[PDB]
Amino acid sequence: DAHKSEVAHRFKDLGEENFKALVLIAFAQYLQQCPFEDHVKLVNEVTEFAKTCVADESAENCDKSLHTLFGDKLCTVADCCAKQEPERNECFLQHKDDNPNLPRLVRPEVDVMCTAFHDNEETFLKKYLYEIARRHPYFYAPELLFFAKRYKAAFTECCQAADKAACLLPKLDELRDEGKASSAKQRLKCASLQKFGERAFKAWAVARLSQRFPKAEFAEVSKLVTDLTKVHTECCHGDLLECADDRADLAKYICENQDSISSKLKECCEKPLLEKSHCIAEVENDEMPADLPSLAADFVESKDVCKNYAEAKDVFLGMFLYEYARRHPDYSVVLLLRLAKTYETTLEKCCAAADPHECYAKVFDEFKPLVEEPQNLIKQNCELFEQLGEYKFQNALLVRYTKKVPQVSTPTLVEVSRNLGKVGSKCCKHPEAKRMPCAEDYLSVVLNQLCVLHEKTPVSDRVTKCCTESLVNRRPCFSALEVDETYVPKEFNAETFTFHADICTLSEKERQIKKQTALVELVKHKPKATKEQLKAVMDDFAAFVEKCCKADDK
Numbered sequence: 001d002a003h004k005s006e007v008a009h010r011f012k013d014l015g016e017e018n019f020k021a022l023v024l025i026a027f028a029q030y031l032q033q034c035p036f037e038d039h040v041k042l043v044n045e046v047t048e049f050a051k052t053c054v055a056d057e058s059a060e061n062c063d064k065s066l067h068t069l070f071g072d073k074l075c076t077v078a079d080c081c082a083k084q085e086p087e088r089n090e091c092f093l094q095h096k097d098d099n100p101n102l103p104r105l106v107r108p109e110v111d112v113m114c115t116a117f118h119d120n121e122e123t124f125l126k127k128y129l130y131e132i133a134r135r136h137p138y139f140y141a142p143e144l145l146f147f148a149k150r151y152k153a154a155f156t157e158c159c160q161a162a163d164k165a166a167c168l169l170p171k172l173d174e175l176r177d178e179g180k181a182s183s184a185k186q187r188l189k190c191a192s193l194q195k196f197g198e199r200a201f202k203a204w205a206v207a208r209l210s211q212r213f214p215k216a217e218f219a220e221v222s223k224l225v226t227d228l229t230k231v232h233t234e235c236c237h238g239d240l241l242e243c244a245d246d247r248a249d250l251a252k253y254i255c256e257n258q259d260s261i262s263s264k265l266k267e268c269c270e271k272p273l274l275e276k277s278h279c280i281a282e283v284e285n286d287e288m289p290a291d292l293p294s295l296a297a298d299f300v301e302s303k304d305v306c307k308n309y310a311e312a313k314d315v316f317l318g319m320f321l322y323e324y325a326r327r328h329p330d331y332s333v334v335l336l337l338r339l340a341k342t343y344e345t346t347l348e349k350c351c352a353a354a355d356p357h358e359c360y361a362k363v364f365d366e367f368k369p370l371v372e373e374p375q376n377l378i379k380q381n382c383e384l385f386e387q388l389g390e391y392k393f394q395n396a397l398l399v400r401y402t403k404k405v406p407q408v409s410t411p412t413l414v415e416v417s418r419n420l421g422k423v424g425s426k427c428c429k430h431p432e433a434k435r436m437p438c439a440e441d442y443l444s445v446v447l448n449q450l451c452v453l454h455e456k457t458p459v460s461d462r463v464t465k466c467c468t469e470s471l472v473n474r475r476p477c478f479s480a481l482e483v484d485e486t487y488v489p490k491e492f493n494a495e496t497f498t499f500h501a502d503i504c505t506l507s508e509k510e511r512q513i514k515k516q517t518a519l520v521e522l523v524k525h526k527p528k529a530t531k532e533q534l535k536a537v538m539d540d541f542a543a544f545v546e547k548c549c550k551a552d553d554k
């Protein structure tokens, strides 16, 4: 019922509707260029074959692995198809394009969308899945099903509203916003798994879940981490059916053991299937249990620290991280991992010393400068964010980071510097207790986006170094890059700074993105230009943009 035919097992577990969507997502993420209709046809053939296996597990080919089945179908349409089943899937994952040369989707008129929704609802919702999945080849697949459900509900409600556009546009805009943030967050999970391995992933998971579920026992935290790691390993490896199935299993287990996990899950666990998993994944930290003793008695002052550590290294350090993380919801996850790495380093050298107890007696003192550094960086950047506002703050990042690495492409500089500025909008509104996890964890996400974008088209050996070194040290490494001195400026191209009448039909947001694009190209043309020389240009360009259109002369 769960062994002889894998494709039948997952079809039964997930049901036909989610099965077909997850297969469509997998096909769109592997072959991002193939047209929509072709992928649908392949999905339908896979689905009709899966049904025969449900009817008879011993039917021909029903015993094949999902990768063999899915790989075979894709290869009926790029050297990957000449490879045997293990190496073949790895070749597919390697060719996923993080920024494919696809035209951005132009949202049509609201009436045009609602009429297409009512014409063929099935095709409308499949195209939505397809266009998102092929542009975000690492999107968290079960979470994409949840976005699709909200997308459908928005059209179902608003296309019946008296004012369709006033109802629909705000729901679509926040879905797009939430979808971009979810994509970047999941991309970081897959990058850490692929580049730094499962041990690094599980440590991150131990830290975050201990902060989120501080009342749970270490055995409970470890069990959840193990299952969550399998979920994301499957999803990041393209095992989307297993990933969705295991994620629903995990949500079902969490909800059946609330009493030993958290007091924050009552509401989440009354929601339907897709909403429940989403709700659980973003539930607030539980209150930490009171009267929790200090870590000193068992991790510093104890005489059996070296003995307990040597008997089980990874378990002891995992226990340390769990105990420290549950006590510090106010620390970022990268800080908590750095502190746990410090403890391990101290233990390795001190347990070999002549007097181990004296050697590691002051290990917690070494945490003080590690804690203070991100606290001051955030306190200083939030002030600058308050003096400038988001758009000016983004501009200041644009010039500084363009000078540091002028070889990075202008779209990457614009995207990344804009997202690094949004940290202030997202996090500086919190108190000091919440700023650091908000800011530092958001910085990890956006810096990872820079790393994957640069990995696509490498130009700087220094960016590669920061990206391939310690994940927890990325933000310090990027901050210390220094201005590139040997960069010879590009010859001035007037076609770059020549705006057409089409600029005034764009939204205000797009025009601000175009101004930021010209600002980067300005710095590249004159890297030693001062702030007043750049401000005089941008203020002149902005004035010319408003002028040459408020006056009707085309």
Ligand SMILES: O=C1CCc2ccc(OCCCCN3CCN(c4ccccc4)CC3)cc2N1
Pocket: 377, 378, 381, 382, 385, 401, 402, 404, 405, 408, 412, 413, 414, 416, 417, 420, 421, 423, 424, 428, 439, 443, 450, 475, 478, 479, 481
């Ligand atoms: O596009 C590129 C490519 C070239 C490049 C090289 C280095 C680089 O370093 C960024 C290092 C982190 C900077 N943070 C630090 C703090 N962060 C903040 C903002 C508000 C509130 C709290 C915190 C602002 C931004 C970025 C880029 N960008």
